[PDB]
Design a protein around this ligand. Structure first.
Ligand SMILES: Nc1ncnc2c1ncn2[C@@H]1O[C@H](COP(=O)(O)OP(=O)(O)O)[C@@H](O)[C@H]1O
Ligand SMILES: Nc1ncnc2c1ncn2[C@@H]1O[C@H](COP(=O)(O)OP(=O)(O)O)[C@@H](O)[C@H]1O
Ligand SMILES: Nc1ncnc2c1ncn2[C@@H]1O[C@H](COP(=O)(O)OP(=O)(O)O)[C@@H](O)[C@H]1O
Ligand SMILES: Nc1ncnc2c1ncn2[C@@H]1O[C@H](COP(=O)(O)OP(=O)(O)O)[C@@H](O)[C@H]1O
Ligand SMILES: Nc1ncnc2c1ncn2[C@@H]1O[C@H](COP(=O)(O)OP(=O)(O)O)[C@@H](O)[C@H]1O
Lengths: 93, 658, 253, 257, 253, 101, 94
């Protein structure tokens, strides 16, 4: 399991979810942020975790979702994840 | 994935809080273009399961999910075909079919919807009777309209709630044949619910046979390997179609047979008022939950009053005591309860149920220094060494003949290309004095518990070599076994006994309280050793004793963490396919019933929800170092795919009720 | 024809014949069939609409005047029976909260409302309608409300998997299902309405079938009894056709 | 036994204002005493009419049916019948139901002796425990139980059995078939069951006859069941000869017709 | 219990308040709950069996006065379809030869017989009983004569397979198969019978309910309407008891 | 040296810290996020992103405490993503990797 | 390459601006967190800075210097790893 984390403009939410819902990736946490760049913007923080193979597929969709050339559109942070434990079931990995 | 029935645990509410549990932990994933058929003896939840899928009912826990998005209300994407005819009598068949399309396809006007009705009424074959009324139509094709209507809206999960069961057998046929052409001509998935075996197994792709009685759950997902293009009179002549039909018929018979027994068991004389409950155990730090349950008064907290812990000396004493009635509820090794219920050794099968598996991952296969200096440092090294020459063929050791010490050890040896009973020798030796056994030289290896294995490391008489974690990090080692006779008697004093140990496991699992337990396990009446012998692996980094730095084993004495406390069937059944692999017992032909008889999860479920605990045990694929993907629905195939084994012999094992 | 139409015609002759010979017997001093149509053939049988003034019109007018009241009445009940009948039954709570009240109110016979109906409405004409309206909704309302809750569970579920909830539900599943029950309610409502109109006039008088039969009894003449029996048979026929009229529309739907 | 119930070319022609229908045509059956003939066939093939004809409820209109050389023309207690709807009076309790049959056939028998006959013909069917419940208050499976018990209260020669197991669940049939089979080898009464489920007939039969469907139905391909008389349900299905028969019957009902 | 008793009592409270607040309107000249029960409490509730001597006793005697008439009467009609009903039906030839006549006679409104009933019988007491007998007879035998024509074909076959015929056939197959339908006729008949008695006394006078309402209504007084509405409650309530108790008898068999 | 991040139900808080505090973990960094998964409604849901850093010894025990407390039974209860941390620094003293808390 | 994820008091946000920009890397991400340590819940803010690995020391010291308060609720600094980040505007492996 690997983590994929991206920052996108607030009004672009219904461009990655739409690009991801039909991509077979259901699940994502979106939280507000206040970036600086270059007073503070009101960007959005989309956060997903997927297997290693799906990173290339999902990452391409995210960049292709909010793709408008204007400085200050965010990046795609990705981090490792040792375990992903559900709550309803309690399974592992 | 497509429709997947997540863990669904529909509870039915009854007067006086009956809480009659219909289904529990029904896990089942359906792919696209599948025709899963939910065969099952009447009494279990079949319509209840289908209603949940149809959405007409709300699942108490969890819930079915379609295309990765839950369904909470009925919708025209998962149609149904009710057992009752359910046709609007005041509408012609064309208008009956027009009811669904006129409502769903609201974006299409007249003309482009007339074709939909006309063609759908034609594929099902209900062509000539297109203007009649449901009263006029006979019962035969009165159920074709319901199928035609359901297919008219082009649904995604067309369900079939035993649509044609009232019809006679001849009309039961010649209607499946019509329903076969639709499946072959079109691409439609379904979840059929049928009572007749021939109904399923004939137009289905994967039979999901449910268990019986309260707390139902899928027992065996039978698979039907027939080429999908099917003809009712050509599949019948398939070489291996009647073989499958005898598997379903045999299974359904067992539920019929092993349901009157359940009723008989309930209606039996109750037990007396026991003054003292004698519990047997063996000296091992892994037995902490039982000991701490007493010294800390956990038994008293639940009003169990006096309990006597009759410490044993050899593992055979526990087996003899419980079966003979001398003791009762003796903490015993993981694999022997399923060994006594099958009589591993031609002994009389005496039922011994398991409900509170209470430890895991506490075994270490240590070898003597002779192999260490020789060059043995892993499985591969040993295999070459033995191949050199017999040279006093190595004789390993095991605590008990039939348990998860003589099975996993054999599996580890077998996977290395070594025959346990030919290339080496396994001799049962009590752990108490096995420490002196290695010094004598009678054996060279161990499969004992924690405190005794470290003795060789501290005395420099051997090295740990292998470990439970690096062989299988779910390895059961202890389980609470009570004679099935002493379960209908004394319905209480068992749940209170089950509850007491669960709390004892929880208390002794926290790293903070483990220090206190160290002193309690160093008394003459309990495991008697110098306190600086059990520290390793419990509250100290494990010392492998093979010229390597100690490594802190985070989970090497699991008691509560990672959901240890659950008698899951999938891994007890893996023991049957290993006792049979070595010829210790014929592989039971009715494992689907013995397995749900030894693992009494009904007791644990009532002792977890009341106490507060994750009652839903994990689906446990038996993952060893070399995961072979054990499939707990076709053990015979798995048992036939192992390179080293003994002649497989399948027969029905019969056990007296008592 | 000869097995179902001819026989009853024979029944009339035998029934009439036995009815004869009772004139000679002093008991049952009723007009004889031979002379029942003797003094009534000319003035009444031949002329239905024998208008001559006020409260003296021929039998034709009386039937229309009485039948007209059951026309204007029983329609303010049928409209108020179907409507307000579905509203009860869909909600189990309200049904059980008023069901016992209708049961008691459904049993009070006609001509028990009339004494109080006249009090509220001084005029005589708008009192026969009220008694008919209030004595005819009960049979309709009880038969309509029961039909709503006797809808088979089969039709509800097939109306649920299809998202038919809304107004379309009540015009494709509920209403067409209770139509058979409504006509069962109208079967006895129409007859019960006729049961009161004929008896709702001989107490308050006025033009109509009632007060023609009743007034004849009060005034003894040479033709009083003959006209009562002649009127007594028309009430039977009109009742049959009026009730059988609802028996024909029922077949169509 | 040589010449028990025989059907000699019976053929019934219904009015059918549109013309002829000839639901039956050229039927030739020879039932031997102590057999279990079965008439498995499609719906609407005239199979019910055939037994409904020997039972005495119809006239062949083309031939005669001879029971010991005595033509059958009227219903009687000899050809005791068992209907599909259980034909049970909801007023009389289960006990009084059986007593109705015995009384109507043994009128002069001493009172309190018929009470014994009905009582002793209620344990062979396992129904003496419930001898007071009304039919409306008894299980559907047990309801069918007192229709052969009533039919066995008399001493009949031919026990015509219209499809009795048309509503029983798949579990009650297994128990009921054995009970019906068990009592068959106690009296040795010819029985002419009508059964749709093919697998039932092979387990429970001696000579099953399949009649071709359609307007002109004819008896064809009279099978023979060679399994041992003390039938074991689970010992024949796995036998490698019940396969060659069942799949052959399916080849005469679905493939051909 | 609390889910089926509380609801209906709520309706009365809503009915009472709705019934109340209509007195404030002078045009709506009807008594209100506060006083319609107040003055009537002493002379007609606390002492139901108050006897004065001349057609002016208490309500209890008035109710039992008419209840006796429908009891002594309607028992001749009670055994009408029980005897005459079964004789018809078992004879298909005559059943079709009497159906049209009884259908017409059945629908003739009750109390339309009274004008000729008083003509046949000079007295009044054996005139308000005949009206009940001739009006309640039809629903009993018509609903009994339908059973003999609709005994299930299943029960006929079970009787034909045995040699059941003659008297033994009647008392074990046919007659018990009409009892479930006879009690449908009695339920309709008794309710329809109650209608005639209440209205019949309103035109012949004398002691008995019904005449009480007309007697009070005609004799306008300070609070005549106070007890008429109470009399409405009794006649409505009493009829419920008669209708429901007959159903209870049908429950036993 | 492991970092728990347990997305839990919006209201299940006050049952996590009450139970979790008994496990010796005192420091928490609860937050608020909008979630979208297999639950039905109307398109985006509200969840708390409980965020905890724990020692490797009790990582398997802290996760167990949250699971029991935050469990509901119906879907949409969240997950627990455990990620590593290399140089956790506490600005009170700028100590080494050890939490000291 | 290290996802510095320090937690600071709300009042100490504008001060770090000079230090953050002076460090050579100014862009970052900010959010609000209902922190809970010793001190009920009290509002704080969480700052995420993906600083280059070779300059992790040069940034951590500045944050503490500008975030030094002394009283309770001082805050903590986390250092999480990353393997490669990409720019959504361009999409270049880093
Ligand atoms: N060190 C950092 N860590 C995390 N996010 C950052 C960092 N620096 C900048 N960002 C985010 O990246 C965005 C700037 O995107 P962009 O304009 O493409 O790059 P730049 O601003 O460097 O030209 C800002 O809104 C900010 O939220
Ligand atoms: N209203 C109810 N109250 C309590 N239990 C119920 C209710 N409805 C169904 N059940 C339980 O659900 C189970 C399955 O019922 P049903 O669907 O009718 O049979 P099956 O599931 O075998 O088709 C039964 O064992 C029954 O006890
Ligand atoms: N009154 C009738 N007029 C004409 N044909 C009839 C009549 N009653 C029955 N039939 C015909 O007799 C045929 C034989 O029916 P049968 O097969 O005995 O019924 P089952 O399928 O229940 O055994 C039917 O196909 C039907 O068309
Ligand atoms: N891939 C993912 N990455 C991050 N969060 C997720 C992911 N999948 C699900 N979640 C979170 O889990 C919550 C419930 O989603 P879901 O998994 O559909 O239900 P459940 O956890 O009960 O299976 C959502 O609110 C969502 O924020
Ligand atoms: N182990 C931890 N997990 C999550 N957050 C923590 C942890 N340790 C500290 N924190 C954060 O830092 C703050 C610690 O406050 P406190 O315990 O008073 O010590 P300090 O005074 O150093 O801040 C809290 O607001 C909390 O959000």
């Amino acid at each position: 399991m690997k983590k994929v984390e991206a920052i996108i403009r607030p009004f672009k939410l219904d461009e990655v979810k739409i690009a991801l819902v039909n991509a077979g990736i259901v699940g994502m946490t979106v939280s507000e942020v206040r970036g600086f760049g270059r007073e503070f913007l009101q960007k959005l923080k989309v956060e997903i975790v997927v297997e290693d193979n799906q990173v290339d597929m999902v990452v391409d969709k995210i960049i292709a979702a909010a793709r408008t050339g204007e400085i200050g559109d965010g990046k795609i942070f990705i981090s490792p994840v040792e375990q992903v434990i559900r709550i309803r079931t309690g399974e592992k990995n | 994935t497509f429709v997947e029935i997540d863990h669904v645990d529909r509870i039915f509410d009854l007067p006086n809080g009956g809480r009659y549990i219909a289904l529990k932990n029904i896990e089942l994933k359906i792919k696209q273009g599948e025709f899963v058929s939910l065969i099952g003896h009447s009494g279990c939840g079949k319509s209840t399961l289908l209603n949940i899928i149809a959405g007409l009912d709300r699942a108490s826990i969890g819930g079915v999910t379609l295309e990765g998005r839950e369904i909470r209300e009925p919708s025209p994407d998962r149609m149904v075909v009710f057992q009752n005819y359910s046709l609007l009598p005041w509408l012609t068949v064309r208008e009956n079919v027009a009811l669904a399309v006129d409502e769903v396809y609201q974006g299409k006007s007249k003309g482009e919807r007339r074709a939909i009705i006309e063609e759908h009424i034609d594929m099902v074959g209900l062509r000539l009777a297109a203007n009649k009324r449901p009263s006029e139509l006979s019962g035969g094709m009165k159920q074709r309209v319901a199928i035609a209507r359901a297919l008219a809206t082009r649904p995604k999960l067309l369900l079939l709630d035993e649509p044609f069961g009232a019809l006679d057998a001849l009309t039961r046929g010649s209607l499946q044949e019509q329903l076969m052409k639709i499946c072959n001509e079109h691409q439609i998935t379904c979840v059929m619910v049928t009572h007749d075996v021939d109904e399923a197994l004939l137009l289905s792709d994967r039979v999901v046979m449910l268990t019986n009685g309260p707390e139902a759950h899928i027992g065996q997902i039978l698979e039907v390997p027939i080429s999908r293009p099917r003809q009712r009179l050509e599949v019948v002549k398939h070489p291996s179609y009647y073989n499958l039909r005898n598997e379903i018929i045999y299974f359904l018979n067992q539920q019929k047979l092993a349901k009157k027994r359940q009723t008989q068991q309930a209606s039996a004389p109750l037990g007396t008022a026991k003054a003292v409950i004698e519990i047997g155990f063996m000296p091992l730090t892994d037995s902490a939950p039982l000991i701490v349950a007493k010294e800390k008064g956990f038994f008293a907290k639940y009003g169990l009053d006096n309990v006597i812990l009759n410490r044993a000396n050899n593992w055979q004493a526990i087996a003899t005591g419980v079966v003979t009635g001398k003791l009762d509820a003796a903490q015993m090794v993981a694999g022997m309860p399923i060994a006594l219920t099958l009589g591993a050794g031609s002994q009389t099968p005496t039922p011994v149920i398991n409900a509170l598996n209470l430890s895991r991952n506490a075994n270490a296969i240590t070898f003597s220094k002779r192999l260490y200096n020789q060059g043995v440092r892993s499985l591969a090294d040993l295999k070459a060494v033995i191949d050199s020459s017999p040279d006093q063929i190595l004789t390993l050791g095991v605590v008990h003949s039939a348990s998860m010490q003589n099975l996993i050890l054999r599996y580890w040896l077998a996977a290395g290309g070594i025959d346990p009973d030919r290339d080496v020798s396994l001799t049962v030796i009590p752990p108490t004095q096995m420490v002196s056994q290695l010094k004598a030289g009678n054996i060279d290896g161990y499969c004992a518990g924690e405190p005794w294995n470290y003795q060789a490391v501290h005395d420099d008489l051997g090295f740990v070599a292998a470990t439970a974690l690096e062989i299988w990090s779910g390895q059961p080692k202890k389980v609470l076994g009570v004679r099935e006779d002493w379960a209908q008697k004394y319905p209480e004093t068992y749940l209170n006994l089950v509850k007491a140990l669960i709390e004892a496991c929880k208390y002794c699992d926290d790293l903070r309280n483990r220090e206190e337990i160290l002193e309690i396990l160093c008394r003459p009446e309990y495991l008697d050793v110098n306190p600086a012998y059990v520290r390793s692996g419990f509250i100290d980094p494990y010392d492998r004793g093979d010229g390597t730095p100690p490594q802190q084993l985070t989970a090497y004495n699991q008691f509560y963490l990672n959901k240890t406390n659950y008698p899951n069937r999938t891994e007890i059944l893996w023991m049957i396919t290993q006792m049979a692999r070595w010829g210790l017992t014929p592989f039971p032909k009715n494992w689907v019933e013995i397995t749900e008889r030894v693992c009494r999860t009904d007791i644990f479920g009532a002792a977890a929800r009341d106490l507060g605990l994750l009652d839903i045990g994990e689906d446990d694929p038996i993952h060893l170092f070399d995961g072979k993907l054990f499939n707990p629905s076709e053990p015979i195939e798995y048992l036939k795919s192992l390179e080293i084994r003994r002649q497989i012999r399948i027969e029905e094992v019969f056990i007296s009720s008592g | 024809l000869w097995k179902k139409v001819v026989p009853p015609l024979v029944a009339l002759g035998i029934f009439l014949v036995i009815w004869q010979l009772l004139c000679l017997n002093p008991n049952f001093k009723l007009p004889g069939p031979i002379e029942t149509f003797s003094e009534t053939w000319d003035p009444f049988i031949i002329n239905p609409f024998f208008d001559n003034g006020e409260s003296d019109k021929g039998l034709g007018w009386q039937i229309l005047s009485s039948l007209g009241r059951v026309g204007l009445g029983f329609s303010l009940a049928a409209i108020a029976g179907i409507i307000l009948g579905i509203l009860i039954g869909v909600n189990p709570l309200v049904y059980n909260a008023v069901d016992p009240i209708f049961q008691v109110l459904r049993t009070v016979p006609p001509l028990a409302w009339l004494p109080i109906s006249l009090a509220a409405f001084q005029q005589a004409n708008p009192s026969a309608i009220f008694v008919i309206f209030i004595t005819s909704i009960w049979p309709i309302l009880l038969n309509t409300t029961v039909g709503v809750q006797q809808i088979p569970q089969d039709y509800i579920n097939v109306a649920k998997v299809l998202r038919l909830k809304g107004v379309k539900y009540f015009f494709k599943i509920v209403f067409p299902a209770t139509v058979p029950y409504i006509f069962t309610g109208l079967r006895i409502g129409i007859g019960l309405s006729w049961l009161a109109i004929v008896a709702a006039e001989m107490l308050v008088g006025g033009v109509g079938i009632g007060s023609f039969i009743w007034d004849a009894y009060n005034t003894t003449t040479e033709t009083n009894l003959s006209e009562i029996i002649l009127a007594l048979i028309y009430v039977g026929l009109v009742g049959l056709l009026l009730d059988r009229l609802v028996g024909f529309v029922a077949s169509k739907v | 036994t040589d010449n028990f119930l025989v059907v000699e070319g019976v053929s019934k022609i219904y009015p059918t204002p549109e013309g002829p229908y000839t639901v039956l045509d050229g039927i030739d059956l020879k039932v031997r005493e102590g057999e279990f003939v079965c008439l498995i066939g499609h719906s609407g093939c005239g199979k019910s009419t055939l037994l409904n004809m020997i039972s005495g409820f119809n006239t062949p209109s083309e031939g005669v049916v001879l029971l010991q050389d005595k033509p059958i023309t009227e219903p009687g207690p000899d050809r005791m019948m068992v209907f599909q709807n259980y034909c049970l009076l909801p007023w009389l309790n289960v006990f009084e139901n059986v007593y109705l049959a015995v009384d109507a056939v043994f009128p002069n028998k001493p009172q309190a002796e018929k009470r014994a006959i009905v009582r002793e013909h209620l344990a062979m069917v396992g129904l003496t425990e419930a001898a007071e419940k009304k039919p409306s208050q008894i299980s559907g499976g047990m309801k069918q139980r007192v229709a052969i018990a009533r039919a066995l209260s008399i001493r009949p020669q031919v026990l015509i059995l219209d499809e009795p197991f048309g509503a029983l669940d798949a579990i009650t049939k297994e128990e009921l078939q054995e009970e019906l089979l068990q009592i068959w080898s106690d009296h040795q009464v010819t029985v002419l069951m009508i059964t749709h489920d093919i697998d039932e007939a092979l387990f429970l039969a001696d000579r099953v006859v399949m009649m071709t469907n359609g307007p002109a139905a004819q008896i064809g391909e009279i099978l023979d069941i060679p399994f041992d008389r003390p039938r074991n349900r689970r010992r024949i299905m796995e036998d490698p000869k019940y396969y060659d028969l069942r799949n052959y019957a399916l080849d005469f009902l679905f493939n051909r017709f």
